């Protein structure tokens, strides 16, 4: 299976989890409580955890910024080698 899907973990719990990771870019996808039925991406960066809304379009694609994907899986894999962040280079990598 994919090791990055954490189901309905609350935002705060995701932060507590990720804050213990060793590498920037360690991440999870979670089922948002504030946008029920939508997804959120949480990522370690330094002493912070950053959160991204997984946006959706009229065809049901998934995206963070402007490039769009047919699945969460494809969005995640894209962002292993293209930054999630517009402020810092952050590449997704699986939790350890």
Residue numbers in the entry: 57 to 152
Q: What did the paper state?
A:
In this study, we report the crystal structure of Grb2 SH2 in complex with a CD28-derived peptide consisting of 8 amino acids, including the pY-M-N-M sequence, at a resolution of 1.35 Å. In general, the folds of the Grb2 SH2 domain were essentially the same as those previously reported; consisting of a central, antiparallel β-sheet flanked by 2 α-helices. The phosphorylated CD28 peptide binds to the Grb2 SH2 recognition site across the exposed edge of the central β-sheet. The phosphate moiety of the phosphotyrosine (pTyr191pep, the amino acid residues of the CD28-derived peptide are denoted with a “pep” suffix hereafter) directly interacts with the side chains of Arg67, Arg86, Ser88, Ser90, and Ser96. The side-chain of Asn193pep at the pY+2 position forms a pair of hydrogen bonds with the main-chain amide and carbonyl groups of Lys109. The 2 methionine residues, which are unique to the CD28-derived peptide, appear to contribute to the binding mainly through hydrophobic interactions. The peptide adopts a bent conformation similar to the type-I β-turn, which is the canonical conformation of peptides bound to Grb2 SH2. However, the hallmark hydrogen bond between the main-chain oxygen of pY and the main-chain nitrogen of the pY+3 residue (Met194pep in our structure) is not formed. Consequently, the CD28-derived peptide is slightly lifted away from Grb2 SH2, making it a more “twisted” conformation than a canonical type-I β-turn. A very strong electron density, which was interpreted as a cadmium ion, was observed between 2 molecules in the crystal lattice.
